[PDB]
Structure 1
Amino acid sequence: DPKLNFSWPVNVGPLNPHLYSPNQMFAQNMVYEPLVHYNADGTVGPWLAESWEASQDGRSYTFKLREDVKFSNGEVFDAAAVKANIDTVLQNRPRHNWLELVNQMVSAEVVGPYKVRINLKKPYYPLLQELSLPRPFRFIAPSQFKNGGTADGIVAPIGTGPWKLTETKLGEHDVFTRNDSYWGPKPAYEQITVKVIPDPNTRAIAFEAGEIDLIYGTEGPISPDTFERFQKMGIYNTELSEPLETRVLALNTNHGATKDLAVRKAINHAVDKDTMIATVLYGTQKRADTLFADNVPYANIGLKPYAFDPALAARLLDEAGWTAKASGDIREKDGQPLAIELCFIGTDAISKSMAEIVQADLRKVGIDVKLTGEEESSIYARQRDGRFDMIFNQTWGAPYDPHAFVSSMRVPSHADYQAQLGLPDKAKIDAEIGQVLVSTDETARQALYKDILTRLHEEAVYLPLTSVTAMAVAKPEVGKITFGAMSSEIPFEKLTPK
């Protein structure tokens, strides 16, 4: 059976299901599995739990587990194993409390041999999405606990997944073997070797020499340069996923010229995102016309894009009192120039190149963008103070969207809060956000998000720029790449070599 060589900058880690770095999320996803599965269209479906019910008040969920699942060592996957895992996570609460699902979780109880009930302090509809995460709610054989838990180490990384970790060589590789007693469909590949290649130039050469078959990742492991270099050779398979998270400029409704709706709309009409993507990103990301893409839960609401239309942008400006003396002039309104400050982290090359593109494009319609590249700490001070006209931001990505990012909009010291402060409907928006997070009603939930996202779009609070995507470069014999529904999901089990 066929074997795959995969490159990664680092070793996969010890693969503890309940800890973070140095454990790599994609590798945790190969070995361990969640109760429920996040789909690429934003829905959540059955996985280790075949069924579930939420109590009427939304504070308890009872999961009915599959009855045909074994851990890779042959031990039973059941309600007892799930509770044992949940409990060791909750006993290490300080590590995990950043996740609002954990923060609201009171307890787990065994209510049948294959039924587990999860209890919350208050309703929290994103429970299902956050259960689909690579960590911390995936399941190791409890026999692998050390001293009654996982927080201080595990015996061996024994999961229920389609892959088993069978060899680790630090600085060299990690080898995963197909789990031939996996409960689901069996992988076409018998073996996945993760080769440790931290140096991008070495990775390129290794891919040339045929020492690795697949490269896969987002902005992190793969530069636009790297993807461009391979896609132009025209002999490999190169593909991009569906949108994962959105990069935006937040425009400050409470500060400067961006207080004016016409100016914010003009900005949305005057940046050529397609050219920005083509030049700065080498086509490795997709144009975003809305804050959230239509594969984000509750966000498929048919918002109309602001089309690239610099003449219209000029008409919106002039028709708001921001007029140009002559053709190429910086516009003015009551003595004052149309100058706006765009603040970004000065050592971030991509953001910097994007900011320079924004500056050039907006200058064409009479806007003087001042570029203020500064250190991260200085940028966080600006976000919280509202001392910006435009500032870069990013959504959280699947499966955290839209709830995580929207939730932060109503919290002071977040960029989005400061940027939205000038909206007359800010208090109402913040009330709807509070209501949507505790909503137990799916119809109400869609209506609430529709209203929130529609107001943010129509009031042009954002300049949505790009959708980050997973990139894949593969030898043609690997076949079509099936992309994960979240950035940390690399579906080796779905590869079918030709």
Structure 2
Amino acid sequence: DPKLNFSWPVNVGPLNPHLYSPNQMFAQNMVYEPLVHYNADGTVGPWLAESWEASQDGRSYTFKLREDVKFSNGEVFDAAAVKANIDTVLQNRPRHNWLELVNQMVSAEVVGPYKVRINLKKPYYPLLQELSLPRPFRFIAPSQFKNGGTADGIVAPIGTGPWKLTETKLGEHDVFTRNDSYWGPKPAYEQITVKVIPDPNTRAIAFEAGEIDLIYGTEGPISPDTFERFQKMGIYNTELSEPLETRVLALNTNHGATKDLAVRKAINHAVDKDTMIATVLYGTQKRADTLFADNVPYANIGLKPYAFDPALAARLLDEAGWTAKASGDIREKDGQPLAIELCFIGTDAISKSMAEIVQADLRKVGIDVKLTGEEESSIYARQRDGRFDMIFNQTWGAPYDPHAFVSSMRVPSHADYQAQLGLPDKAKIDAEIGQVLVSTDETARQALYKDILTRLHEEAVYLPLTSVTAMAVAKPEVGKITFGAMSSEIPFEKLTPK
């Protein structure tokens, strides 16, 4: 029974299974479990539910539950528990109605001691995938409710999962202890200590001094130069994942110079992503040329990349009326200079390093990118108002992409909707997104996703940049390195020391 030291930039949170920030998804994933399980091969399999049947119309799903599960406090996991959980989520729809499964779900019914029926307004093909997510459909013991729910807080974070939160010291650490009565396989580590360490350089120093045993994260747990250093050094186990969600810039089709398709195409041709990846990222993320990568369901449709071609960029601009005067000037149209704001939350280190590169590259073709690294509330306001020319965004990874991310494009207060608002075919895109989510036919789903994604690509709504990757670094004694099936999943339970 070894112990593991991990680190994270913030405390894990109160670990409410049905709330969002400040609860950390990786930690929710350690404690609470779903009815069905997303696998790395894209399939969804049994988990708390052993099997399930679907009505002829696809509107009702009856889930047969395992009869050998208990919450970490000894309380029985059963159909009434699953109902009480779903009900408190459905009593709080405004927090959850970003998730289309919630919108479709009507009721949960107990139809046997270990059998739960879920009823929907319509057949909804992402049902099983969205039931597998970190939240909100995972299960706390109902004895832990307050006011008959979880929206106003919980007594203690009691789940059925392989780890229990046993100690929290604010600003210092969160300690997870192995659930010794877990229903599934027994984890080889008895304890994970998550040390709260906010700065990535501080994290590397702590790692080299033997105070942290494993680095693992998708948002730069250490700097790219440090990852490079570690790997060359050749004493550690180091690995990068396959491509996860895509980092993009969204270009505003409804606002500023990006209203012009020719400007958006020029932008996509003038940024040297290969150099950006080689210099600032040291090869730790793969170039992305489309909104979704080839490994996303329905997304491998053979779209043609916008090649790095700065001369072509120049030409398109010229024929849009954006012309220069002397060599090295900012282009002008109708006595209006080609100035474009690029927005990102100012504490986001990776985004900042990328923004600076985008600025330099576009400057070579006559575009004055004005960098705006702002405070979070200021950025949020811009997103809803559509008050941006270019703004950083990213997809959601597995198993959210593409269904849940395209679904969010429909919401007026979102950056993706605001950026797409100037497209002549915006209404048709949104109507097709709705149709694809409730389609019961695979041929139709392929055609629909192909059309939606082709329009977004051919209209140059996005500047795709890179594929996010989980980076992992570990002393060899920790053992083999495995990546979670989901972006947010850190499989501590699969680590086997030595």
TM-score by length of 2: 0.86
State how far apart, in whole Å, the 1-side matches of 2:158 and 2:368 are. 58
| Residues 65, 461 of structure 1: alpha-carbon distance in 2 compared, 3 angstrom cutoff | same
Task: Give the conservation status (yes or no) of the 8 Å contact 2:254–2:418.
Answer: yes
| Residues 198, 262 of structure 1: alpha-carbon distance in 2 compared, 3 angstrom cutoff | closer
| Residues 199, 365 of structure 1: alpha-carbon distance in 2 compared, 3 angstrom cutoff | closer
| Residues 89, 302 of structure 1: alpha-carbon distance in 2 compared, 3 angstrom cutoff | same
| Residues 117, 488 of structure 1: alpha-carbon distance in 2 compared, 3 angstrom cutoff | same
Deviation of the 1:35 alpha carbon: 0.8
Task: Give the conservation status (yes or no) of the 8 Å contact 1:163–1:176.
Answer: yes
Task: Give the conservation status (yes or no) of the 8 Å contact 1:280–1:350.
Answer: no
| 1:256 is the counterpart of 2:256 | yes
Deviation of the 1:304 alpha carbon: 2.7
Deviation of the 1:467 alpha carbon: 2.0
Deviation of the 1:290 alpha carbon: 1.0
| Residues 163, 410 of structure 1: alpha-carbon distance in 2 compared, 3 angstrom cutoff | closer
After TM superposition, the structure 1 stretch with the greater mean CA deviation from structure 2, 143-152 or 107-116, is 143-152
Task: Give the conservation status (yes or no) of the 8 Å contact 1:432–1:452.
Answer: yes
After TM superposition, the structure 1 stretch with the greater mean CA deviation from structure 2, 487-496 or 57-66, is 57-66
After TM superposition, the structure 1 stretch with the greater mean CA deviation from structure 2, 375-384 or 361-370, is 375-384
Deviation of the 1:478 alpha carbon: 1.8
Deviation of the 1:316 alpha carbon: 4.3
| Residues 3, 281 of structure 1: alpha-carbon distance in 2 compared, 3 angstrom cutoff | same
| Residues 270, 480 of structure 1: alpha-carbon distance in 2 compared, 3 angstrom cutoff | farther
Task: Give the conservation status (yes or no) of the 8 Å contact 1:6–1:192.
Answer: yes
Deviation of the 1:351 alpha carbon: 3.1
Deviation of the 1:45 alpha carbon: 2.9
Alpha-carbon displacement from aligned partner over 1:219-255 (angstroms, at most 9, x marks no partner): 2755546545644644322322233322212223344
Alpha-carbon displacement from aligned partner over 1:18-75 (angstroms, at most 9, x marks no partner): 3445543322211221012223454433322233334344433222223443444555
Aligned length: 498
After TM superposition, the structure 1 stretch with the greater mean CA deviation from structure 2, 319-328 or 390-399, is 319-328
After TM superposition, the structure 1 stretch with the greater mean CA deviation from structure 2, 221-230 or 425-434, is 221-230
| Residues 328, 148 of structure 1: alpha-carbon distance in 2 compared, 3 angstrom cutoff | closer
Deviation of the 1:463 alpha carbon: 0.6
| Residues 275, 112 of structure 1: alpha-carbon distance in 2 compared, 3 angstrom cutoff | same
Deviation of the 1:292 alpha carbon: 1.5
Task: Give the conservation status (yes or no) of the 8 Å contact 2:204–2:222.
Answer: no
Alpha-carbon displacement from aligned partner over 1:278-319 (angstroms, at most 9, x marks no partner): 333344433221111233333232323223233443454456
| Residues 129, 312 of structure 1: alpha-carbon distance in 2 compared, 3 angstrom cutoff | same
State how far apart, in whole Å, the 1-side matches of 2:296 and 2:178 are. 32
Task: Give the conservation status (yes or no) of the 8 Å contact 2:33–2:159.
Answer: yes
| Residues 169, 364 of structure 1: alpha-carbon distance in 2 compared, 3 angstrom cutoff | closer
Deviation of the 1:132 alpha carbon: 1.6
| Residues 444, 203 of structure 1: alpha-carbon distance in 2 compared, 3 angstrom cutoff | same
Alpha-carbon displacement from aligned partner over 1:197-232 (angstroms, at most 9, x marks no partner): 445555333322212201222327555465456446
Task: Give the conservation status (yes or no) of the 8 Å contact 1:324–1:366.
Answer: yes
Task: Give the conservation status (yes or no) of the 8 Å contact 1:230–1:236.
Answer: yes
Which residue in 1 is equivalent to 2:329?
A: 329
State how far apart, in whole Å, the 1-side matches of 2:272 and 2:199 are. 33
Task: Give the conservation status (yes or no) of the 8 Å contact 1:41–1:296.
Answer: no
| Residues 102, 344 of structure 1: alpha-carbon distance in 2 compared, 3 angstrom cutoff | same
Deviation of the 1:96 alpha carbon: 4.1
Equivalent residues in 2 for 1:378-397, closer than 5 Å? 378-380=378-380, 382-397=382-397
| Residues 48, 190 of structure 1: alpha-carbon distance in 2 compared, 3 angstrom cutoff | same
Task: Give the conservation status (yes or no) of the 8 Å contact 1:250–1:461.
Answer: yes
After TM superposition, the structure 1 stretch with the greater mean CA deviation from structure 2, 447-456 or 482-491, is 482-491
Task: Give the conservation status (yes or no) of the 8 Å contact 2:79–2:110.
Answer: yes
Task: Give the conservation status (yes or no) of the 8 Å contact 2:220–2:471.
Answer: no
TM-score by length of 1: 0.86
| Residues 354, 48 of structure 1: alpha-carbon distance in 2 compared, 3 angstrom cutoff | same
| Residues 168, 485 of structure 1: alpha-carbon distance in 2 compared, 3 angstrom cutoff | same
**Secondary structure, aligned partner of 1:52:** strand
After TM superposition, the structure 1 stretch with the greater mean CA deviation from structure 2, 71-80 or 441-450, is 71-80
State how far apart, in whole Å, the 2-side matches of 1:71 and 1:347 are. 39
Task: Give the conservation status (yes or no) of the 8 Å contact 1:289–1:306.
Answer: yes
Alpha-carbon displacement from aligned partner over 1:442-466 (angstroms, at most 9, x marks no partner): 4322321111011111221111112
Alpha-carbon displacement from aligned partner over 1:412-443 (angstroms, at most 9, x marks no partner): 35333333334332232122122223333343
After TM superposition, the structure 1 stretch with the greater mean CA deviation from structure 2, 343-352 or 297-306, is 343-352
Gapped regions of structure 2 (runs ≥ 5): none
Deviation of the 1:117 alpha carbon: 0.9
Deviation of the 1:110 alpha carbon: 1.4
Deviation of the 1:108 alpha carbon: 0.8
Gapped regions of structure 1 (runs ≥ 5): none
Task: Give the conservation status (yes or no) of the 8 Å contact 2:201–2:223.
Answer: no
State how far apart, in whole Å, the 2-side matches of 1:488 and 1:133 are. 10
Task: Give the conservation status (yes or no) of the 8 Å contact 1:338–1:366.
Answer: yes
| Residues 315, 161 of structure 1: alpha-carbon distance in 2 compared, 3 angstrom cutoff | same
| Residues 308, 67 of structure 1: alpha-carbon distance in 2 compared, 3 angstrom cutoff | farther
State how far apart, in whole Å, the 1-side matches of 2:22 and 2:6 are. 18
Task: Give the conservation status (yes or no) of the 8 Å contact 2:11–2:171.
Answer: yes
| Residues 49, 364 of structure 1: alpha-carbon distance in 2 compared, 3 angstrom cutoff | same
| Residues 264, 169 of structure 1: alpha-carbon distance in 2 compared, 3 angstrom cutoff | closer
Task: Give the conservation status (yes or no) of the 8 Å contact 2:343–2:373.
Answer: yes
| Residues 155, 429 of structure 1: alpha-carbon distance in 2 compared, 3 angstrom cutoff | closer
State how far apart, in whole Å, the 1-side matches of 2:191 and 2:346 are. 42
Deviation of the 1:180 alpha carbon: 4.7
Task: Give the conservation status (yes or no) of the 8 Å contact 2:220–2:350.
Answer: no
Deviation of the 1:182 alpha carbon: 3.5
| Residues 170, 316 of structure 1: alpha-carbon distance in 2 compared, 3 angstrom cutoff | closer
**Secondary structure, aligned partner of 2:67:** coil
State how far apart, in whole Å, the 1-side matches of 2:52 and 2:324 are. 62
**Secondary structure, aligned partner of 1:332:** coil
| Residues 222, 42 of structure 1: alpha-carbon distance in 2 compared, 3 angstrom cutoff | farther
Which residue in 2 is equivalent to 1:198?
A: 198
